[PDB]
């Protein structure tokens, strides 16, 4: 199938599934958003969850090509990470492939099909550069990278859905700020 | 109303939402746990919203006591918190409810319900002895307390659901140990 025309309905999808969550999403708006008919969605996405299970894999898809690009801005490993979740931060802010993705996952009890499991493709990015931190010196003794991916993750989550609960993200710089400063200086040599 | 009979209903109600979440709940069920009429439940909860608001409130209801309780046996400010973020762990794993409590929270757009706002509760109920840290010099330098407040709530609630959405909190007990470490030491002197 087309990547363009599946691009074109992730994205309206993203749009819709992040400003209405699953149930208020309908197939026919997503086609209606894209100039398309219903069956040229369901040609690409056969049913509903299909298209949920889709727009949460591809909240997860960018984020790997965006560690390599931090690299190459010359951030150290443990620099890497930091400015990992500050992109995530802001793509949560502003993106609403990040927003469907995470609001997707967390009307996940009530999604009649097996989304990809969460937290754990975060845990295991951030783990290498936290790896490369600690054999490079820049991790303090005794932080163990695989526990730091997991706290951070963990921490940044809840960060961010603390701030679309209470404020709509409003406020999300400025709490991943406080938040980031703290757990930062906990892990660095 | 009598205070026996609402605790008797609040705690089935608490099993009963921590198993099934609000939609599987009914009072009917609630009422045959307790062996009461579906009459003598709705007297004292006219609706099933009336109910999760109820046990909803109960969960945050005994920890003022518990930190005062803390208070008592000797610990510091800084390390009231520790030990109140401990509890709260322990209760998390072990306590219906407090599984109830948040399984309703995570619902929350789906109960039509005003429920209590959450994690504001227990932010402005940490930053007390947050305060109290700072004025006894147990805080590092620069660390503002409301700020500190406010990532620990979250920080600490992304750990807990991470771990009940992956592992049924199975494992909620070693993911805050590793999460406090780091916490705690970026916050004291």
């Known amino acids: 199938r087309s990547i363009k025309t599946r691009a074109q309905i992730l994205e309206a999808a993203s749009e819709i599934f992040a400003s209405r969550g699953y149930r208020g999403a309908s197939v026919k708006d997503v086609a209606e958003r894209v100039g398309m008919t219903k069956g040229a969605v369901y040609f690409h996405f ?6 949920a299970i889709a727009v949460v894999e591809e909240h997860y898809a960018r984020w790997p090509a965006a560690m390599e ?86 921490a940044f989550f809840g960060m961010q859905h603390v701030s679309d609960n209470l404020h709509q993200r409003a406020d999300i710089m400025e709490r991943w700020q406080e938040l980031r400063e703290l757990m930062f200086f906990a892990l660095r040599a």
């Open 46 to 51: 056969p049913s509903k969850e299909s298209l």
């Open 69 to 154: 690009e931090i690299r190459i801005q010359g951030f150290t490993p443990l620099e890497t990470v930091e400015e990992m979740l500050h992109r995530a931060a802001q793509a949560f802010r502003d993106d609403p492939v990040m927003q469907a993705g995470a609001r997707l996952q967390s009307e996940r009890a009530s999604i009649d099909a097996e989304l990809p499991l969460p937290y754990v493709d975060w845990t295991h990015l951030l783990e290498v550069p936290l790896q490369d931190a600690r054999e490079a010196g820049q991790l303090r003794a005794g932080v163990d990278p695989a526990a730091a991916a997991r706290s951070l993750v963990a």
